[PDB]
Amino acid sequence: KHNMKAFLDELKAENIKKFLYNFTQIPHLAGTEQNFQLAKQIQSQWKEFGLDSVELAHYDVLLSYPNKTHPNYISIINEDGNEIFNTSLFEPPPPGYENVSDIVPPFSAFSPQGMPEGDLVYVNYARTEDFFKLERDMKINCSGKIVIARYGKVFRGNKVKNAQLAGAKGVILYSDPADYFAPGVKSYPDGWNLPGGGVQRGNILNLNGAGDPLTPGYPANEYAYRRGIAEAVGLPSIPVHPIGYYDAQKLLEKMGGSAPPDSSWRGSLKVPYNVGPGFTGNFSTQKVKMHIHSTNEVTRIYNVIGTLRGAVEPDRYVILGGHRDSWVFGGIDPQSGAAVVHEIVRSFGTLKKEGWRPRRTILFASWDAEEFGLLGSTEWAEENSRLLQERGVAYINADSSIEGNYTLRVDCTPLMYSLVHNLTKELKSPDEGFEGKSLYESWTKKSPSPEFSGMPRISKLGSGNDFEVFFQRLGIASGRARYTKNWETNKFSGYPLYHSVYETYELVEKFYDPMFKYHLTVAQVRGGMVFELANSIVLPFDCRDYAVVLRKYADKIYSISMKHPQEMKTYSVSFDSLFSAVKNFTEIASKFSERLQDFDKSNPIVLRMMNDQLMFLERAFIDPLGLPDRPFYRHVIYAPSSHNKYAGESFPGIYDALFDIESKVDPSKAWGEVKRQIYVAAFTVQAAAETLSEVA
Amino acid sequence: KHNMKAFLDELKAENIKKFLYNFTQIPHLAGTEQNFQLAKQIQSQWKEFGLDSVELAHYDVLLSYPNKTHPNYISIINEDGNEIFNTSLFEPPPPGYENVSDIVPPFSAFSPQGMPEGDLVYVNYARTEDFFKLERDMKINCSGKIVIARYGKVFRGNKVKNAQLAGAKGVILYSDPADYFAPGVKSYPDGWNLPGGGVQRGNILNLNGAGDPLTPGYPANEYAYRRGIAEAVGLPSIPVHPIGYYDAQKLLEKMGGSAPPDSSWRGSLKVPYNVGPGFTGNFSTQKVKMHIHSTNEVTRIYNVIGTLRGAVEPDRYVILGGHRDSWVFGGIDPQSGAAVVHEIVRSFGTLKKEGWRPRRTILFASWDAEEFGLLGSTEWAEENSRLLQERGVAYINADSSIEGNYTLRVDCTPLMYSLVHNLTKELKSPDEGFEGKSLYESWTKKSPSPEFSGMPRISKLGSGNDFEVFFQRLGIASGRARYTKNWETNKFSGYPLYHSVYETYELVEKFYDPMFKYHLTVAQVRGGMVFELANSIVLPFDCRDYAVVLRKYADKIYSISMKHPQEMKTYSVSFDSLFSAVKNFTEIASKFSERLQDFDKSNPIVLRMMNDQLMFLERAFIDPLGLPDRPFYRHVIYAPSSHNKYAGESFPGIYDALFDIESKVDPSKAWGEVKRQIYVAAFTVQAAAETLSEVA
Ligand SMILES: *[C@@H]1O[C@H](CO)[C@@H](O[C@@H]2O[C@H](CO)[C@@H](O[C@@H]3O[C@H](CO)[C@@H](O)[C@H](O[C@H]4O[C@H](CO)[C@@H](O)[C@H](O)[C@@H]4O)[C@@H]3O)[C@H](O)[C@H]2NC(C)=O)[C@H](O)[C@H]1NC(C)=O
Ligand SMILES: *[C@@H]1O[C@H](CO)[C@@H](O[C@@H]2O[C@H](CO)[C@@H](O[C@@H]3O[C@H](CO)[C@@H](O)[C@H](O[C@H]4O[C@H](CO)[C@@H](O)[C@H](O)[C@@H]4O)[C@@H]3O)[C@H](O)[C@H]2NC(C)=O)[C@H](O)[C@H]1NC(C)=O
Ligand SMILES: *[C@@H]1O[C@H](CO)[C@@H](O[C@@H]2O[C@H](CO)[C@@H](O)[C@H](O)[C@H]2NC(C)=O)[C@H](O)[C@H]1NC(C)=O
Ligand SMILES: *[C@@H]1O[C@H](CO)[C@@H](O[C@@H]2O[C@H](CO)[C@@H](O)[C@H](O)[C@H]2NC(C)=O)[C@H](O)[C@H]1NC(C)=O
Ligand SMILES: *[C@@H]1O[C@H](CO)[C@@H](O[C@@H]2O[C@H](CO)[C@@H](O)[C@H](O)[C@H]2NC(C)=O)[C@H](O)[C@H]1NC(C)=O
Ligand SMILES: *[C@@H]1O[C@H](CO)[C@@H](O[C@@H]2O[C@H](CO)[C@@H](O)[C@H](O)[C@H]2NC(C)=O)[C@H](O)[C@H]1NC(C)=O
Ligand SMILES: *[C@@H]1O[C@H](CO)[C@@H](O[C@@H]2O[C@H](CO)[C@@H](O)[C@H](O)[C@H]2NC(C)=O)[C@H](O)[C@H]1NC(C)=O
Ligand SMILES: *[C@@H]1O[C@H](CO)[C@@H](O[C@@H]2O[C@H](CO)[C@@H](O)[C@H](O)[C@H]2NC(C)=O)[C@H](O)[C@H]1NC(C)=O
Ligand SMILES: *[C@@H]1O[C@H](CO)[C@@H](O[C@@H]2O[C@H](CO)[C@@H](O)[C@H](O)[C@H]2NC(C)=O)[C@H](O)[C@H]1NC(C)=O
Ligand SMILES: *[C@@H]1O[C@H](CO)[C@@H](O[C@@H]2O[C@H](CO)[C@@H](O)[C@H](O)[C@H]2NC(C)=O)[C@H](O)[C@H]1NC(C)=O
Ligand SMILES: *[C@@H]1O[C@H](CO)[C@@H](O)[C@H](O)[C@H]1NC(C)=O
Ligand SMILES: *[C@@H]1O[C@H](CO)[C@@H](O)[C@H](O)[C@H]1NC(C)=O
Ligand SMILES: *[C@@H]1O[C@H](CO)[C@@H](O)[C@H](O)[C@H]1NC(C)=O
Ligand SMILES: *[C@@H]1O[C@H](CO)[C@@H](O)[C@H](O)[C@H]1NC(C)=O
Ligand SMILES: [Ca+2]
Ligand SMILES: [Ca+2]
Ligand SMILES: [Cl-]
Ligand SMILES: [Cl-]
Ligand SMILES: [Zn+2]
Ligand SMILES: [Zn+2]
Ligand SMILES: [Zn+2]
Ligand SMILES: [Zn+2]
């Protein structure tokens, strides 16, 4: 039989390992020749594996690279202007790659050039609340200071935006061992910890979903009209550079001014973590100087797009997508995911060669330039937005397959909760101690849901990966899954070797997944989801699971507002309409579910009608006017947090209207905007509910 | 048989006449009790006629009304401040209606209150080119002047916007006999001409598609959050009032300053048409004073929405819609159209009662508050936008059925050209001299197309009626048809009694259509279109007809640009991408047409696929970011002219970027924006073409 079991049994751990080795021997930086060669290889292999067509889709987008003959670095400079200490020009390469060429040195992609000189202020994680504490409570002014911040807790672009708004003239990012050195584990190559010379690369844009900074709204094709740099979306206005903790120790050890306000501000290095500004008395005339010479340049990128045409509904698309570009070797990010996609394509192609076809069309994508702001996925979706809007059933992301070896992690739309529960109950757990038990059982045991008991945790989608354009711009049901570390020990900073030269095939093979069993489990979960989405007669979405979460989010946002009972009285701020809409959604969704079970199974138009209502339900939460000042975040239920792009926020328009509202100087205006966002949310929920009513 | 002939033969001229009489005995002003009573009547009758459901959908929107105890009027005031001449407080009522109550007096809906006093400037039709001529050529400054403009040529809202931007402090609109008195025809009640005491009502908003001024984007339902007046969309900032030509003669006869610049500026009254400013020497100290006391008020309106559920595709909607609210009796506008819709509903209901159902669902709408800015249609479409986006096949408008008695007029999307040609070839001409000939033959003979010979004229959709939200906001294929006057004699100002108290049942029965044969012909054309759209197995749209017009519009916009060859050289302004896209569209559309003819007729999914490609083709021309500063005009091929809302403009984004470009002070920026709009248009055309490619 050609069923899901046939598909699943064809997936092999050993193939995933061979592909991972193959994809991680040389760097595949976006816009470089090596990454175009790899694209051409994947295109040729997907063709051999049996897909119907495999094409490259290219775009010319703004990228950013250090200047090879003028390297970036930071100094301590004395009153004469002698540079008495210099940060490193490169990470020490790992064993056996010390002769690899074209390792891009650590830098912050999209930083402007400059050589600012000044006194340091230490700003902890440079979160919105860190700056509140500095400015409001401690009275420290960052205006014209260079700020130093530890990586972790929030996306680095938000840190840089927050420093810029505080008036900083430069930002230094570093990895603290508190956040990137796990107790009792050795540094690479002897374990999976970050060495003191290790540095995390990463872009520092604030794109808010725009894609290529120069062409928001439209694909960066051959005739595209580009904004000038000064009108580009999302570029930082102050120089930024990342360093490791050996160098950070040298910059921090002399810090003076105020003490850290409390222990949440202290990392693990042997320094006081003083906030500053500037250095202690003896060194008070030394300053810090950055030298940044990176350049932004329009550069061609390439996505690989494979198609496996559907037998029954070829005009319905189920998409499995993940990126291919890496900062260096990409041993975890992204190639642990790309190897998994490669083996999924191979398995589907095996079934195809024997004459099977899925019911719906399956699109496979190897995206480029994800590391530079989701550019490949977003330019392609801009180009194909009309096809995706009217035909896109679901998007499953496929970046890193592992970030730990403890249990499953799934983030997805409520529409996929039931599908995920059911599929995982049919898969074998790879975990020690759960031999012969289901993945569902191990996952539920190790990662209990906060709400439900007997159920596993499934998180909201945030952002910082290639599903953003599909989910929050276009409203296509989306999900992601990988193996992860313990939620109980999770400091939310990323695995220690994230975006460092030490993320290699050996890291994975030696320390994360030597038998490739977690990789195989993730290939079964991602591939299983794609299979069910592309092949189930009725789309495997349960609208009633959205009803349950909508009530939870409505409770949550009401609770936030209720911290201000006096203002809700004064301005007549009612959540009645939103609760009403969520009640209606629950009632209509219950009735639609009854019809979906009871409908005449013989009638295909009835079937295509009800599958269209399921497909367009995520679509209904899109507001074409977008959220305030963020036109590409159009989903009313979920947006990336305005304070941390990685995190999802629910009822984002109402959340942001309420955030810090006690500080607004015109409360009437502020609470008016809260009411406006309540109206928009209640309306959108009711309208989405009405798409599930009988059609006529 | 229940086929189109059965439907068409059931329509009766005599029923349309009875309904028109019934709908025109009392005024049905939006927001009044009389118009709610009529809504309730139509709801009850559509139920009796056999529709499956008939509901009222209500909204609370901003309307505008004179103050009953403080009437509007204009004076000539002498240096003491005695008002030596006053304009009329009402139109003389026609014979037999002199005792009708609640005739709203002439006023400009949405005018602010004020009593500005000043010197007059005469501005011809207050068109963009009229103001260019005054300011640039004649050096007349309108700043702080009251301007007087004759109605005609362009929508009155554009006149008021243009006066406001010239710095006027008030605007007086009047009907010139040059534009509203046909040679040789008597004034009402003895003929169809406008008497000197006649006045044209009408709103003066510039909504640009927004709907209710207080709730742009969202329906004005019970919990809606409303903008304050100062942030409302589209309201004029200077007082405005309309008058007839007896009163206008009194205001104009004393005009001094400059002579009219040429004869295109002179109407037919016995006055010099001097431009001013102010009056001749002896009267130079007399001024003009307005007194406007109308108020804007949120008021409930009611749409009637009837549903005839489809037998095969109930989730596909074909909509026949026209408004019900009138300025006074609405003998032509809108009730000549509403009577036609009433008889169409009756005929469909007859077939339904015998067991027939159309293939697709048919929605019938009686919209409210069209006269106040398309408010009823637009609030409903805002409420139901997700259903309409994913399910709307077509919208046929049904305002006035007649504006003359000469020949057919059709304005529609190219997608409906073939349907209209074919249907009219099967209908009988009602015209004298074409007895036993087809409507197609009479229409082609009397209204030849400028491009084609052997073909009839079919115009672009403009705006100023209830299809605007469906076509230019949501991208649903739309059309309209009515009987019209001779294009050769057409001065484009409207029929003479437009929006006057003299537009009555008698006007129509005595002077326009005594046998109701033109009404019947229009019921056959509108109803015939709805029938074919709701019942044809393959949707009756021909994508190749869009390809032909796209090439015509691309030629036209290129020709405009080519008036500036030096700048196109300097700034490298190329139309190559747009011509390329139009070529591709033509090629793909030709191939799609071959498949549509050759496809396996047995396969319904193949059928639903190809009907979806046809339905979403108009949808593909929507840009979700909208046109510059006009977020509700989202169609890239057609928008209402920025200088005249009634007229359609093709490639509007490129047209406006080119308009008056030789006057822009930064030509580099201006031609940059031209290039941007070329890129957007070429991209949208290519993307729409790609929706017709094979799907996978
Ligand atoms: C959840 O679904 C429910 C039930 O299906 C839906 O209920 C609707 O509630 C609205 C809003 O209250 C009702 O609106 C009323 O409609 C009647 C005519 O049917 C009007 O007379 C009412 O207006 C009067 O009263 C108002 C309130 O006091 C006054 O402000 C006003 O001036 C009038 O005097 C009012 O408009 C509507 O009838 C029901 N519909 C149905 C089918 O029951 C509810 O709105 C849904 N929730 C959301 C968030 O959409
Ligand atoms: C109408 O349809 C046609 C044909 O189907 C479609 O043609 C496409 O044209 C584009 C734009 O010219 C082609 O793009 C080229 O693609 C190749 C790789 O296939 C690139 O090497 C080319 O780039 C080089 O040359 C450029 C131009 O001189 C340089 O600027 C650049 O730096 C590179 O050196 C170029 O990107 C594309 O291959 C074809 N596609 C096909 C299938 O033939 C055309 O674009 C359509 N019109 C519109 C408006 O979409
Ligand atoms: C990764 O695997 C690919 C595919 O097996 C290798 O590319 C092949 O290399 C052989 C021998 O050099 C060529 O003859 C083939 O044409 C290549 N095939 C394709 C599709 O490119 C590649 O060498 C491997 N890379 C590494 C680093 O091992
Ligand atoms: C840090 O790097 C800087 C720049 O390379 C060094 O300063 C330079 O030293 C060279 C060699 O002595 C001089 O010729 C240049 O004039 C100096 N350049 C600048 C910009 O100051 C500096 O010596 C290094 N400091 C340490 C401690 O290694
Ligand atoms: C792979 O799994 C092992 C086993 O759980 C992890 O190591 C254990 O984890 C905790 C530290 O959080 C310790 O208390 C145990 O003592 C560890 N056992 C052993 C044998 O080391 C290991 O951390 C995982 N590898 C990765 C990269 O996460
Ligand atoms: C997940 O599996 C459950 C249990 O099989 C499915 O729920 C059943 O669906 C069948 C088939 O329609 C119904 O007749 C049963 O009554 C359902 N059982 C329960 C407890 O609800 C569910 O539909 C599956 N979810 C998905 C998305 O496929
Ligand atoms: C317009 O026609 C309607 C429907 O025939 C008339 O309304 C009916 O009036 C009768 C007698 O007064 C009532 O008993 C019915 O209940 C009404 N029916 C409905 C559906 O409203 C109405 O009187 C006519 N109006 C005019 C001006 O002639
Ligand atoms: C035009 O109308 C105005 C306002 O009604 C007239 O002026 C008023 O006349 C009455 C009666 O004489 C006075 O009591 C008011 O004081 C006047 N009001 C104002 C605002 O001036 C005026 O007489 C009328 N002019 C003509 C020629 O009929
Ligand atoms: C109804 O049709 C008649 C016949 O065409 C129109 O009157 C004629 O039209 C032109 C004026 O444009 C004259 O040259 C003829 O002499 C007229 N003939 C007659 C008998 O009047 C009439 O204008 C139409 N009615 C309306 C309201 O448009
Ligand atoms: C308008 O009528 C024409 C002529 O009947 C239709 O074109 C024909 O369609 C048939 C049926 O598919 C084809 O086999 C013929 O070859 C077509 N003839 C020509 C000359 O094209 C046309 O499809 C109708 N248009 C609409 C929208 O229904
Ligand atoms: C990089 O720096 C060098 C050497 O100082 C300079 O000549 C060149 O302009 C720079 N390259 C780029 C791409 O900016
Ligand atoms: C911070 O410094 C700058 C001037 O050096 C000033 O404009 C700004 O107001 C200061 N703010 C505070 C709160 O000290
Ligand atoms: C209309 O004018 C009267 C009488 O001068 C005034 O008392 C009333 O306020 C006005 N009515 C409205 C609705 O503005
Ligand atoms: C028109 O009048 C006002 C001042 O009365 C002035 O601001 C404006 O510049 C004038 N413009 C011209 C062109 O005369
Ligand atoms: Ca873009
Ligand atoms: Ca609205
Ligand atoms: Cl992922
Ligand atoms: Cl119309
Ligand atoms: Zn990644
Ligand atoms: Zn990454
Ligand atoms: Zn009308
Ligand atoms: Zn009208």
PDB file of C-alpha atoms in Angstrom, chain B residues 173 192 232 363 374 388 639:
ATOM      1  CA  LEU B 173     -22.679  75.296  -7.081  1.00  0.00           C
ATOM      2  CA  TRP B 192     -37.837  66.977 -19.211  1.00  0.00           C
ATOM      3  CA  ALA B 232     -13.237  61.681   9.737  1.00  0.00           C
ATOM      4  CA  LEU B 363     -27.587  37.571  -3.674  1.00  0.00           C
ATOM      5  CA  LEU B 374     -21.990  54.561  -1.196  1.00  0.00           C
ATOM      6  CA  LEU B 388     -16.802  38.143  -0.847  1.00  0.00           C
ATOM      7  CA  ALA B 639      -9.300  53.510 -10.308  1.00  0.00           C
TER       8      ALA B 639
END
